[PDB]
Amino acid sequence: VKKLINSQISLLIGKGLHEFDSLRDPEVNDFRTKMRQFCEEAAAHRQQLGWVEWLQYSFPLQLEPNRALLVNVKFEGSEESFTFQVSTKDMPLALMACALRKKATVFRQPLEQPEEYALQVNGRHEYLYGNYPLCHFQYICSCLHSGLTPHLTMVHSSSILAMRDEQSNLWSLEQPFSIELIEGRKVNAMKLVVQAGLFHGNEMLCKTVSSSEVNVCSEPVWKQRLEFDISVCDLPRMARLCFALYAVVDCPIAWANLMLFDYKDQLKTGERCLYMWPSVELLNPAGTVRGNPNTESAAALVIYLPEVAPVYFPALEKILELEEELREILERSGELYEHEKDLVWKMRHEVQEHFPEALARLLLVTKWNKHEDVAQMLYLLCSWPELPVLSALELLDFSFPDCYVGSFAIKSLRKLTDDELFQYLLQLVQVLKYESYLDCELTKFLLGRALANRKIGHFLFWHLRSEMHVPSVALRFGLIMEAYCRGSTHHMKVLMKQGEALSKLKALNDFVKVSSQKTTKPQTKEMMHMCMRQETYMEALSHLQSPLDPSTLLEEVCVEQCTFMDSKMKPLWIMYSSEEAGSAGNVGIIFKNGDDLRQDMLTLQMIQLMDVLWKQEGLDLRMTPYGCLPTGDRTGLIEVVLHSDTIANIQLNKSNMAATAAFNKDALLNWLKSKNPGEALDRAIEEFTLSCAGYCVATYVLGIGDRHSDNIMIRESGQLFHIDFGHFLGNFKNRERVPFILTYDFVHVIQQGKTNNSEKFERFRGYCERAYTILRRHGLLFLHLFALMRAAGLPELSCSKDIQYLKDSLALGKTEEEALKHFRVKFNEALRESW
């Protein structure tokens, strides 16, 4: 039975656990046991929560960032149901009470308090409970805007408890620092050099040193000594040694990095063999500090770590043993001349006292290649007041490589609400890539939070699982997933069911790719349907939680509605229905295989954020942040938005449609008039107008380029949205400066199909201005989030030039005033550009 579990984990994570063992490694071996402990105790806590608490773990509320309402309620065993009039201001308890009083009369009354129940959304993994107005609940909202009547089910507490039950599991060393560079094993055309250097973060702890010029063979021999311009007793606990190997007459060949203190803080010695990574300013301090696992093909560099006695980096305990100014004027870019830094350092007790939020600026002027300077910084750190989340996020960057610091950030991040934490999860994962060691505060934090909230849990898994084909993080992520599963047996089973669907989806897609190159779509579609109709398909692809959103259930797959697009990577359109969920169960997914959805996922998340900030301030721009999740190697899912189309498509202005325009510009409006007759039209134009304003501003600020009519969509409701985001930050395909954009087809619709409507247009103008100004108030939030993502190795997000795009598009350089004028400048341009 333990064997079975183990083998299912292996299948889930996509890498056998025997591959962990066979490395014979203390770091790994300790990670696995210590974490297993951690996670299982979390299982223990969970399996004894109160029923409500369980609900919060297992189906977290989905909330919003008056008038009368129709609701249909039913109880768990019967199909008999009741349809109340309720108030959107009513608490769920009120509704439950009504449902009880209705139960008690039909079924003549005993009768059992409302506080025993929770309302489940029919045919979804969603519930409604807690002291909230009914329309604070996302699902309730959905229905309101879209006409529909809420279908809920009274679930008694003991039913929930049955659920909970079924899911049970030294400064003494002054000499300079030297290594020996012996030899290697590898390929090129000339002469070979290695250069070395010591980094603490992006910072060099002294001048790098080079190798002497050796002939271009395959098994080079230096046997060199290499002494660095720092004392040994100075090295900071996080000192990072970096090499680059290249040829010369420059040809980069490979790189390699390691920590100088092992993970139990022992200064390392003596011999290391270094299995290097292929080669893409040659030095790469950010890159993984574990070696290439391709040990039969990686160039290897043997080095030697001299002995100097054993020596353990000091305990904190020891570390801790060791004018009327203008400093404010300097305290507001953040790059600064030398005297300026010396000031900060001198003033550092004042910064802790009267500018606690300047921690970061101080960490950067602090002298990490001087142990003394480090101990006082730390001294100060140990009594430093906690920081707001936004400063914490700043601290997570590569620039702050020290563990004590790392830990203080987590210490500030702990007050994250589950909803905020979810908003940043993508970033906190990509950051694991910077970790020096396996066992770390962050991982523990992520594991702890995942284990306490099944949705964090769900998405952590997929973020991790989607990078398994990436050698440099295969080991770390595989280990984290493993831990996670030890903490959740039942979830592991739910997630396997998802991997299986994915798997078949991959098989089905490959067959589609083949069949299509030997026949007509119609023919291929009928084949697709047949292969789907096989039991093993029918069964694998049905009854699962959607990896795009676990609260959506994909019940029965409607084969007659499935298809593929005949072009490119042949994506799959797979549709579901569910008797239980009624209309709400009619959902679809799109399976893409051959593209990289990572950058789309990032963009749509910045758009989701943008919406939340706008909403937090009372502006709902009617955005469509649809689900998009990479799940494997150039593989992932995209949520289907029903009742929508592409602009381009509506503009094929095909005869014998409702939309038959005499002039092409009418096409778009014709279509809305057909989807929104008589009185309904006014609504749709308004929707169109708000969504258009959001996407105008989000695409501008993000530098989303390559925008055709075939990657912009409208919903029958009026809402316009952008899809397919493959180039951003001006990086259209090299790097331009996309203007604000404004299609004339849209200005037509905003103005209700009239040539002048300054009235309607100048509203629109305001929307834009507003959406724009709010974003700016959270400029840093974007800056810090985009900074953390430089870790993903997204090729359109590599460097300084990339994030620059944002500072500018947001003009965080200018003031509340001059930003807005400057904005209007590029708005009227875009305007007069509309022919």
Ligand X SMILES: CN1CCN(c2nc3ccccc3cc2Cn2nc(-c3ccc4nc(N)sc4c3)c3c(N)ncnc32)CC1
251 binds ligand X (CB under 6 A): no
Distance in Å, CB of 702 to ligand X, minimum: 15
Q: Which of residues 136 and 598 has its CB atom nearest to ligand X in the complex?
A: 598
CA distance 643 to 587: 11
How much of the chain is helix, strand and coil, in % rounded to 5? 45, 20, 35
227: left (phi over 0), alpha (psi -120 to 50) or beta: beta
Interface segment toward ligand X; rule CB under 6 A; list 87-95, 641-649, 728-736, 810-818: 641-649
Q: Which of residues 89 and 643 has its CB atom nearest to ligand X in the complex?
A: 643
Interface segment toward ligand X; rule CB under 6 A; list 62-70, 190-198, 633-641, 652-660: 633-641
- The residues that bridge with 301 in the sheet, in sequence order, are 184, 274
563 binds ligand X (CB under 6 A): yes
CA distance 386 to 375: 19
Q: Which of residues 150 and 703 has its CB atom nearest to ligand X in the complex?
A: 703
C-alpha torsion angle, residues 650, 656, 657, 663 (rounded to 10) = 50
Orientation of helix 521-533 relative to helix 489-515, angle to 10°: 150
657 binds ligand X (CB under 6 A): no
Identified binder of ligand X from the candidate list 208, 211, 292, 644, rule CB under 6 A: 644
Q: Which of residues 209 and 638 has its CB atom nearest to ligand X in the complex?
A: 638
Strands 68-75 and 151-156 come out as: parallel
State the number of CA atoms in the 13 A half-sphere of 103 facing the CB. Answer: 20
| Touching ligand X, residues 712-751 (CB under 6 A) | 723-724
641 binds ligand X (CB under 6 A): yes
Identified binder of ligand X from the candidate list 565, 612, 619, 811, rule CB under 6 A: 565
Q: Which of residues 641 and 657 has its CB atom nearest to ligand X in the complex?
A: 641
Distance in Å, CB of 742 to ligand X, minimum: 23
- Reading the block at residue 800, the tokens are 């300084």
590 binds ligand X (CB under 6 A): yes
Q: Which of residues 314 and 625 has its CB atom nearest to ligand X in the complex?
A: 625
Identified binder of ligand X from the candidate list 171, 422, 573, 761, rule CB under 6 A: 573
Interface segment toward ligand X; rule CB under 6 A; list 264-272, 306-314, 362-370, 634-642: 634-642
Q: Which of residues 505 and 640 has its CB atom nearest to ligand X in the complex?
A: 640
Distance in Å, CB of 638 to ligand X, minimum: 5
CA distance 253 to 250: 10
Q: Is 761 exposed, middle or buried (0-12, 13-18, 19+ CB in 10 A)?
A: middle
Residues binding ligand X: number (CB under 6 A): 17
Q: Which residue has the tokens 């797959």?
A: 557
Q: Which of residues 276 and 629 has its CB atom nearest to ligand X in the complex?
A: 629
CA distance 368 to 375: 9
CA distance 59 to 587: 19
564 binds ligand X (CB under 6 A): yes
- The residues that bridge with 589 in the sheet, in sequence order, are 574, 639
649 binds ligand X (CB under 6 A): yes
Q: Determine contact, residues 540/501, Cβ cutoff 8 Å.
A: yes
Distance in Å, CB of 597 to ligand X, minimum: 6
Interface segment toward ligand X; rule CB under 6 A; list 301-309, 408-416, 482-490, 635-643: 635-643
571 binds ligand X (CB under 6 A): yes
Q: Which of residues 416 and 698 has its CB atom nearest to ligand X in the complex?
A: 698
626 binds ligand X (CB under 6 A): yes
Q: Which of residues 144 and 723 has its CB atom nearest to ligand X in the complex?
A: 723
Interface segment toward ligand X; rule CB under 6 A; list 109-117, 283-291, 459-467, 559-567: 559-567
600 binds ligand X (CB under 6 A): yes
Q: Determine contact, residues 248/193, Cβ cutoff 8 Å.
A: yes
The long-range contacts involving 601-604, CB below 8 angstroms and separated by at least 24 positions, are 601/426, 601/628, 601/629, 601/630, 601/636, 602/426, 602/789, 602/792, 602/794, 602/797, 603/702, 603/704, 603/725, 603/728, 604/628, 604/725
Q: Which residues bind ligand X (CB under 6 A)?
A: 563-565, 571, 573, 590, 600, 626, 638, 640-641, 644-646, 649, 723-724
